[PDB]
Amino acid sequence: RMSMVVSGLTPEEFMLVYKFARKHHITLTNLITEETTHVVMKTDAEFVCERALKYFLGIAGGKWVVSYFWVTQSIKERKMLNEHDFEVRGDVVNGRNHQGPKRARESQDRKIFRGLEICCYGPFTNMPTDQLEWMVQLCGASVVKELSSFTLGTGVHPIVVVQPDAWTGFHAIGQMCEAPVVTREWVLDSVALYQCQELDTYLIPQIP
Ligand code: NI
Structure with a gap:
């Protein structure tokens, strides 16, 4: 009720x-x-x-x-x-x-993360990883736990989410997979607005 x-x-x-x-x-x-x-x-x-x-x-x-x-x-x-x-x-x-x-x-039909596969990757502060995962899964994303578990193919879109601060290498993620790397703020800003933001602002630089 x-x-x-x-x-x-x-x-x-x-x-x-x-x-x-x-x-x-x-x-x-x-x-x-x-x-x-x-x-x-x-x-x-x-x-x-x-x-x-x-x-x-x-x-x-x-x-x-x-x-x-x-x-x-x-x-x-x-x-x-x-x-x-x-x-x-x-x-x-x-x-x-x-x-x-x-x-x-x-x-609730046009969910901001419809069609996405998200890997919350590495360590996070101020927010338990599983709650962030629950959050994106509530917004219509599929959750992936390993960079290598991304659903290869098309029609789908993988995204790697990190919080730079939290690590003692987050530019060298692109060496391990073929997805955009963005900060947690991508999700948080997106969820707060309930509007999927453009990755531009949030992209993290990846080493060849
Ligand atoms: Ni597309």
Whole structure:
């Protein structure tokens, strides 16, 4: 029926969400999952939040990604207000007005990574590899675990995703396969906007 997680709240703030939850009989969990219907973000007054993992996974799953004002306003009026009317407009990274949560909310047929094969390659910080994988697989990509496991042929498109920082060689990936190499920001920017970005900005230089 209805299930929520929260992001960027103080315990005090969390308490009000639980209050909201009890009142309306909304489920409340710590981990976002398949079932999660709602993601409550701490935003500023114009509905701009931090770019948190729950934010990415919420957009990726076509959920409601709603400002915490949905909660406090709904408590202030003893009624559950319009999820539509509080939705997140953007974030500190991708701009204050991009409206990706809704793009994703409606565009579940035209998924930004339809047709792609993605290998999240090497080591990653601030975000478990499997959650990034889950994220791209939620956006309609096929996940590959080994550079050598890419589906040779055409009609399909492989991409290697890395986070440069994380390694003590990421220019010498092209020596091991025939795919564009891009940074994690390709995915993250793409997911935040729910618009597949052009690799240009994100391509990493590969040695012959
Ligand atoms: Ni093509």
